[PDB]
Design a protein around this ligand. Structure first.
Ligand code: SF4
Ligand code: SF4
Ligand code: FES
Ligand SMILES: [Zn+2]
Lengths: 208, 126, 82, 107, 688, 95, 114, 48
């Protein structure tokens, strides 16, 4: 098991286990899952009524600094009632640790809009509004970043297809660029690559 | 808070941006995919795939490709139960045909009956 | 002019299906002996309202509902149609 | 490369004069290797900053959702505080002084 | 209550006694990898991949053929389980050539998938690798026996289902050829199913051979035609023009098999199709035009022609939507002679009272029968999967099978009662050594073939079969709702057209010669211009017509069975619908779409627009045609039997014989199989 | 070396020459149909049928890692020579 | 199902916000058709604005009407600013469709189109 | 290449037709694929 297998450490695993238990002890109101993966990064799975209390606690409290904010995304999962998962990805400075606050929401719910406690989340929140479709209440500006103005449909969903519905071309009738329904020149052949035979037995869900 | 109290269906079809043609024209077949019969493995089961009907794929007259006027045709939505499939199909607006999941029948095979005395289960070749 | 078809649509567990099964087990060979050239046809699916449809005269399809009618009441309404 | 034919493709001599190497080449290029289900976020010190990638992978041969933390995006977020009390040639100098390529800022 | 505890990987589960270890591991959801176990064939222990470790045991046991003792604990992911699997995999890839590029199962092999997910990475075996000379099993099956792994699953399949006994192991050691010793073309029914059985790319398809690759062709659910059973199929289509027809699995009917004609009958689906509406040109020829000319011509002629003189022969392979639209339109005109091509008798309440024209029991329900008597049929060539079901029943439990009408090549040793309707008269009388077996039987079935029902004795034969049915109904205790009597058909659209209430036979046209007739897929010599007045006005509607298409007047290019959303009924009343996998080439509209547009262009209308409204009128004509993939049997055997007791016909004592007597007459007797070339190749291979 | 239809346009190694009722004859106006004039069928029928004194023989393709992977082919039929699927060049046996 | 709102409590505030937004779109058109140098009279622009408001008329849920008010207010801010160009405002119209008909017969002459 | 000109290979061009865009002699694309579905042929004879 020594060559070409990534050696895991248990000190960081035990410390992140103890710290996740500590966080869920001191915030009993909003905490549902506290998971540590095999490669020792903490994940805290959260009801959407405590985004401001959890992040105001985690930016401060002097035993977990977590000054820096990274990726925010809300991965567009069907099959559930609450679809979207918002992932605040908090990085400390004094500690060298990484935690992922994963709160859940559906299509029509305002989460508490972390722009007041992380100024980096301004364009992150505006981008997630434009691409996914999750409205954020008590927020200064929501406009469309990374999309065209005349374009809509919230394209990063699984429901929006790969090619869009509109397609631009210049024409000389009205002497400008117009939008037309898509007429592709090639199919975009989708391949049926997901072969059977269960490549991981450790991740078998229990059947009905 | 929790001010809104209502028990009604969702109407996201006016928000998701897809036009009325592809709302009320196509149809969603909801099905467990069949086992790829040349292989023998039911790992391709357990996932309720939602797919749409296929439409015209003519020939591109310069190369011989498959051009299409179909944005929604190359979708697949893998789910885990029939109820959430029906809920998503009724929520997002379009029509739906829910097919059936057909389990393999639990049989009883026996090598000792493959080597019987008076019965007609005598394989005569092994 | 006259009739073309009479169609009966039934089910297997209902008091209306009980009444029309009483009719169709007791008085069906009589009716087919009476009119030879009327293809009066019976259908049973799983569970449906027991409809009775008379198709004639350029697509006039008159409709009666045989919901919880007894066999005398079924025969009387069928003779009212025919 | 690694000592595992199921992830890296085998070299071409063993591919030609070996059966299992041909099978692993063929499946490893058509289906690809599978990835166990899970989510990770790694980030390395690119010259612009903490270039981050957050993979979410259902156990399959395709990733489920990837997302990219761009240091240029995070730097361009603070353009107001970097150009509040200065003039417009200094605004051009501020846009230049952060290594912003405007293809990474888009994600 | 017959329960045994097995701890699969520690987790407990109750399992009935007698079952294998692999069925228990599939009861908890695990898959033990396997090569020679198959869930439709007998269990042999040849492949040895299936090994699994039992706790507190020195040896590693085979999960394919091990019964369950009390209280197991099974390790499917232990040390020596994995060592045994990697060992057996390292043995299997030794004498197996480097053909994975040129192979045909390259996307769908099992050596590849299991050598990924269970086997080793680096190989060994520097020198060796035997090579075996390939055979020629048939002109329909390409055979490279170098790739064979000697799993012995083609042999068990042929011997236990096809009943042919031609495939054999020959030799010892490494030299174990699997094939025919005597250069004999293995030509029988279900010969096409052997390419799905062979898990490696040895027995591959001949017309499919080097034309596709399975990660590109997308899969589509669909329903068969040309067989009354309607096996489920999946069309793996390429890019708007298809590839192949694999069998989609249904537990009741047509389990994991398919008919040979179904499997190899799409070459004719792409060989002579109609793409343009065609009109007879006054020089005498048959030119083509746009939709406006042909539909305006048919509309003006149909407006100027009413009365009892309009006919609609709707034969061959047509829909339920097409039948609803045609019957609704021709109801709107004045009246009807709507007919089918094949002749079913309607004297004792034919079309009505559902039980006397379909197959009342389930096709899967014949397994619990005990005495089956076939009358006037050769079931090997008429729905051959029904014959495979009969042989599976006769093989596993006991069946007294008796045949009346023809000494034919059934593969399961029927008893033979002769060729005379007077034999059936005397069975109804009660003087045989076999009617005693009927009245001492438990669950009896009398299966009538419709091929001997086409002749001029049909109502008499049906009345005698109803005599047998009422005789067993009386002279026994009613054990339950078992059903002695049933008939079977050849074409599914006859079942659909008799559900919707058409006249069977062409006698209504023989009585009243019409001035206008619609041939919705009239295949054979149903009617000609010689059996009809001068002003014919034949409107043919369909795809690749070969008989009637020169004779007809207005040619309309209807769609195909893989090319439209249809509604089909099998021989037992189950409703199964096709799916649009490929749009029809050319102009080539659907059938009911043409008919409703013809109604619009003529001076009338049909009161519906789209396909959901069509299916709503389909339910408003007959209600079982919306409960898809579901069955409900009829009743009223006493009422049907007493309605059969009015008209006496003389039973002609001529020797009744089915036309489907041999392989050539199975292969040629359809339009789609007639148009192809693969059927012609195997026809000349069998006849030569 | 190549065949040519009576429409005046060259066929290819695949018989795909156009009819009298197409417009791709008009898309070829002024610009040549750059067809490979070197067919692949006739450069194998000119090859010598090799005769190797063993029974089951190897095929590499002329070079380690320059050529197709090894195929071992059998030469036991008397009237049909064995044929490599990769190469295309035949073999025989001598005894 | 005690759901959190967006802005409103029932359909009353929904109707109030949508009539406020329609008043804004009514007083916002002639400035833009003078500014971006379009080719369409003011009355046709107002008729298609009220057509866009009549398109979503069967919507009943209050959160959905609140979110449509938010969409319309965002696009009205982007049109009262000079951010959107002539292309997008003409893209709201439909002059280059050659529109497909809706009769069954002309859908039959250009078929495979349910 | 005056030392060792390799791999002679009789099919190799002895002409080397150079870069030819904007000439009368250049490449045009076309489908190298034969007949797709083989449309029907009407009979030559008339009736009556
Ligand atoms: S049968 Fe399987 S292992 Fe053998 S050549 Fe074909 S794909 Fe490869
Ligand atoms: S030919 Fe195929 S099915 Fe028969 S023994 Fe060989 S590998 Fe098995
Ligand atoms: S499956 Fe048990 S030996 Fe092949
Ligand atoms: Zn070779």
């Amino acid at each position: 098991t020594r060559p070409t297998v990534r050696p895991r450490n248990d000190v960081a695993h035990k410390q992140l286990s103890a710290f996740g238990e500590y966080v869920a002890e001191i915030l009993p109101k909003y905490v549902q899952q506290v998971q540590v993966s095999c490669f020792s990064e903490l994940e805290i799975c959260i009801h959407p009524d405590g985004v401001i209390p959890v992040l105001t606690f985690l930016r401060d409290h002097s035993n977990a600094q977590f000054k820096s904010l990274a990726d925010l995304t809300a991965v567009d999962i069907p099959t559930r009632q609450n679809r979207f998962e918002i992932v605040y990805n908090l990085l400390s400075l004094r500690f060298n640790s990484r935690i992922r606050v994963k709160t859940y929401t559906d299509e029509l719910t305002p989460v508490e809009s972390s722009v007041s406690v992380y100024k980096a989340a301004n364009w992150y929140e505006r981008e997630i509004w434009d691409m996914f479709g999750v409205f954020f209440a008590n927020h200064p500006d929501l406009r469309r970043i990374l999309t065209d103005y005349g374009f809509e449909g919230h394209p990063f969903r699984k429901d929006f297809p790969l090619s869009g519905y509109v397609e631009l071309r210049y024409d000389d009738e009205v002497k400008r660029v117009v939008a037309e329904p898509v007429e592709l020149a090639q199919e975009f052949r989708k391949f049926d690559l997901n072969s059977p035979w269960e490549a991981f037995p450790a991740y078998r869900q229990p059947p009905e | 808070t929790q001010l809104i109290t209502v028990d009604e269906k969702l109407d996201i079809t006016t928000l998701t941006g897809v036009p009325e043609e592809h709302i009320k024209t196509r149809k969603a077949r909801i099905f467990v995919p069949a086992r790829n019969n040349m292989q023998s493995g039911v790992n391709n089961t357990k996932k309720w795939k939602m797919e749409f009907d296929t439409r015209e794929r003519w020939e591109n007259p310069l190369m011989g490709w498959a051009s299409t006027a179909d944005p929604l045709s190359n979708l697949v939505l893998t789910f885990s139960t029939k109820e959430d499939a029906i809920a998503f199909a009724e929520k997002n607006g379009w029509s739906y045909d829910v097919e059936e999941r057909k389990v393999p029948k639990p049989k009883s095979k026996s090598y000792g009956a493959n080597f019987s005395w008076n019965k007609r289960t005598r394989v005569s070749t092994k | 002019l006259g009739l073309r078809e009479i169609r009966i649509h039934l089910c297997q567990r209902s008091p209306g299906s009980q009444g029309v099964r009483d009719f169709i087990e007791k008085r069906y060979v009589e009716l087919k002996k009476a009119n030879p050239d009327l293809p009066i046809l019976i259908r049973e699916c799983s569970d449906v309202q027991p409809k009775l449809w008379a198709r004639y005269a350029f697509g006039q399809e008159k409709n009666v509902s045989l919901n919880n009618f007894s066999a005398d009441q079924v025969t009387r309404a069928l003779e009212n149609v025919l | 490369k690694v000592d595992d034919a199921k992830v890296s493709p085998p070299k071409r001599a063993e591919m030609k004069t070996s059966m299992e190497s041909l099978i692993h080449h063929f499946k490893l290029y058509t289906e690809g290797y599978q990835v166990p289900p899970g989510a990770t976020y790694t980030a390395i010190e690119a010259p612009k900053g903490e270039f981050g990638v957050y993979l979410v992978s259902d156990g399959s041969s395709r990733p489920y959702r990837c997302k990219i933390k761009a240091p240029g995006f995070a730097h361009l977020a603070g353009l107001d505080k970097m150009s509040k009390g200065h003039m417009l040639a200094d605004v051009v100098a501020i846009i230049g002084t952060q290594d912003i390529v405007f293809g990474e800022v888009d994600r | 209550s017959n329960l045994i505890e097995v701890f699969v990987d520690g987790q407990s589960v109750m399992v009935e006694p007698g079952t294998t270890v692999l069925q228990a591991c599939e009861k908890v959801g695990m898959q033990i990898p396997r090569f020679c176990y198959h869930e439709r064939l007998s269990v042999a222990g040849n492949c040895r991949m299936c090994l699994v470790e039992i706790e507190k045991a020195p040896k590693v046991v085979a999960a394919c053929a091990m019964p369950v003792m009390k209280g197991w604990n099974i390790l499917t992911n232990s040390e020596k389980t994995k060592k045994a699997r990697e060992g057996v995999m390292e043995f299997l890839l030794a004498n197996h050539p480097l053909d994975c590029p040129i192979c045909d199962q390259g996307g769908e092999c099992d050596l590849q998938d299991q050598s990924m997910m269970f086997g080793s990475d680096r190989s060994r075996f520097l020198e060796g690798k035997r090579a075996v000379e390939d055979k020629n099993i048939g002109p329909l099956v390409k055979t490279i026996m170098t790739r064979c792994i000697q799993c012995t699953r083609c042999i068990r399949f042929a011997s236990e289902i096809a009943g042919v006994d031609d495939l054999g192991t020959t030799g010892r050691g490494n030299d174990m050829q699997v094939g025919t010793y005597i250069e004999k073309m293995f030509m029988s029914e279900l010969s096409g199913n052997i390419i799905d059985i062979c898990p490696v790319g040895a027995l591959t398809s001949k017309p499919y051979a080097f034309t596709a690759r399975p990660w590109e062709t997308r899969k589509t659910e669909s329903i068969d035609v040309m067989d009354a059973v309607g096996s489920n199929i999946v069309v793996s289509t390429r890019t708007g023009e298809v590839m192949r027809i694999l069998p989609r699995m249904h537990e009741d009917i047509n389990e994991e098999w398919i008919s040979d004609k179904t499997r190899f009958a799409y070459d004719g689906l792409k060989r002579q199709r109609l793409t343009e509406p065609m009109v007879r040109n006054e020089k005498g020829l048959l030119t083509h035009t746009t939709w406006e000319d042909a539909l305006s011509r048919v509309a003006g002629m149909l407006q100027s022609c009413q009365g009892n003189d309009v006919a609609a022969i709707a034969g061959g392979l047509v829909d339920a939507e097409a039948l609803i639209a045609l019957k609704d339109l021709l109801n709107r005109v004045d009246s009807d002679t709507l007919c089918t091509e094949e002749v079913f008798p309607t004297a004792g309440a034919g079309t009505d009272l559902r039980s006397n024209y379909l197959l009342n029991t389930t096709i899967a329900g014949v397994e619990e029968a005990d005495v089956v008597l076939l009358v006037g049929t050769n079931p090997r060539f008429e729905a051959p999967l029904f014959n495979a079901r009969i042989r599976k029943s006769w093989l596993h439990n006991d069946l007294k099978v008796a045949l009346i009408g023809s000494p034919v090549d059934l593969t399961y040793r029927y008893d033979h009662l002769g060729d005379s309707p007077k034999i059936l008269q005397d069975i109804a009388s009660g003087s045989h050594p076999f009617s005693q077996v009927l009245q001492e039987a438990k669950k009896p079935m009398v299966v009538l073939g419709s091929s001997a029902l086409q002749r001029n004795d049909g109502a008499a034969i049906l009345a005698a079969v109803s005599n047998i049915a009422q005789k067993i109904r009386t002279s026994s205790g009613v054990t339950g709702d078992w059903k002695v009597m049933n008939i079977l058909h050849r074409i599914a659209s006859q079942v659909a057209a008799l559900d919707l209430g058409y006249k069977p036979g062409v006698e209504a046209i023989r009585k009243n010669p019409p001035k206008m007739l619609f041939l919705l897929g009239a295949d054979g010599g149903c009617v000609t211009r010689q059996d009809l007045p001068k002003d014919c006005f034949i409107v043919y509607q369909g795809h690749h017509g070969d008989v009637g298409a020169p004779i007809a007047d207005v040619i309309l290019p209807g769609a195909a069975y893989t090319e439209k959303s249809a509604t089909y009924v099998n021989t037992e009343g189950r409703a199964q619908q096709t799916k649009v996998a490929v749009m029809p080439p050319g102009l080539a509209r659907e059938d009911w779409k043409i008919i409703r547009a013809l109604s619009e262009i003529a001076g009338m209308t049909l009161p519906y627009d789209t396909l959901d409204q069509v299916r709503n009128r389909l339910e408003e004509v007959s209600p079982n045609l919306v409960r898809y993939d579901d069955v409900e049997g009829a009743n009223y055997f006493q009422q049907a039997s007493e309605l059969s007791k009015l008209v006496n016909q003389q039973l002609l004592a001529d020797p009744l014989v089915p036309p489907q007597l041999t392989i050539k007459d199975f292969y040629m007797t359809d339009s789609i199989s007639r148009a192809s070339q693969t059927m012609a190749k195997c026809v000349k291979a069998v006849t030569e | 070396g190549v065949r040519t239809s009576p429409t005046g346009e060259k066929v290819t190694h695949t018989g795909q020459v156009y009819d009298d009722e197409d417009y791709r004859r008009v898309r070829f106006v002024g610009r040549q149909k750059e067809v490979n004039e070197n067919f692949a069928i006739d450069l194998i029928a000119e090859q010598p049928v090799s005769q190797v004194g063993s029974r089951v023989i190897s095929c590499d393709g002329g070079g380690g890692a320059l050529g197709h992977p090894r195929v071992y082919i059998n030469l036991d039929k008397e009237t049909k020579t064995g044929t490599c699927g990769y190469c295309g060049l035949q073999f025989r046996q001598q005894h | 199902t005690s759901v959190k709102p967006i802005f409103s409590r029932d359909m009353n505030e929904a109707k109030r916000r949508v009539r406020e937004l329609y008043r804004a779109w009514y007083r916002e058109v002639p400035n833009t058709v003078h500014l971006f140098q379009l080719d369409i009279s003011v009355k046709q622009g107002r008729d298609k604005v009220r057509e866009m408001f009549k398109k979503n008329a069967h919507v009943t849920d209050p959160r959905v009407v609140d979110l449509l008010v938010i969409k319309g207010k965002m696009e009205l801010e982007e049109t009262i600013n000079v951010w959107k160009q002539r292309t997008h405002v003409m893209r709201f119209f439909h002059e280059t469709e050659a529109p497909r008909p809706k009769d069954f017969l002309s859908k039959f002459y250009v078929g495979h189109d349910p | 290449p005056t030392v060792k000109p390799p791999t002679a290979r009789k099919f190799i061009w002895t002409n080397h037709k150079f870069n030819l865009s904007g000439t009368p002699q250049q490449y045009v694309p076309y489908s190298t694929t034969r007949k797709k579905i083989q449309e029907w042929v009407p009979p030559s004879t008339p009736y009556k």
